[PDB]
């Protein structure tokens, strides 16, 4: 499973 995104807080 993907790492958590880091684009919008």
């Amino acid at each position, epitope marked *: *499973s993907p790492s958590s995104a880091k*684009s919008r*807080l």
Partner: antibody
Amino acid sequence: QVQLVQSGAEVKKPGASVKVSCTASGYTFTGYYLHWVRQAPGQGLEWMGWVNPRSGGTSYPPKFQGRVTMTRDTSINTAYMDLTWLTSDDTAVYYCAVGRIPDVTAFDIWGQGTPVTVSS
Amino acid sequence: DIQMTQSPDSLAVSLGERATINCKSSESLLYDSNNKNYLAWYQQKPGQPPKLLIYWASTRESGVPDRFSGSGSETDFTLTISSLQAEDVAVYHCQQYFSTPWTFGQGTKLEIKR
């Protein structure tokens, strides 16, 4: 008018530190993570970590854990990346970058770049 | 963790003709629970920052002309310029965002063949 405006070029000696700023405009600075990505000659883009402009929290990959300090200053919409123990491998163009797309950690806003030369 | 390898390193294509750039991931960017490929493409013209070109493998970022196309799945991807224009000369990078640290490929330089 969305843009990230970085500071001017830097020349440094091995062992010294370097600190580059990034000034945001045209969007909500406290709405998105602020990342730093460098590009060494013949190397390929390399992510250094991010800073949370709201909380002031950071996260760095192992390679840069212990050398990098990322900080913000929301009064002036400005982020800072600070790198210590510089060597020749730290010679690169340093970019700040923002991603605005939900669940997509890819960057659609970039600073013009800050070249950093490290030499004795 | 995830390495990204692009091929070729350098590419020359005639004006009007078709350009193809591949990217190999070391692990697989497809999540079986949403059927999405976690892969982005960038265009970098000389002396300027990267510009986001394609994300989710095949979705074009807003403003990207139709001639740019992304395809592929899992570990094997491809960026295609169908009718090469002059302003398309640049270095193209593929970036995975499945896992952190977010990692890029080494870049592929695209130049006009004459």
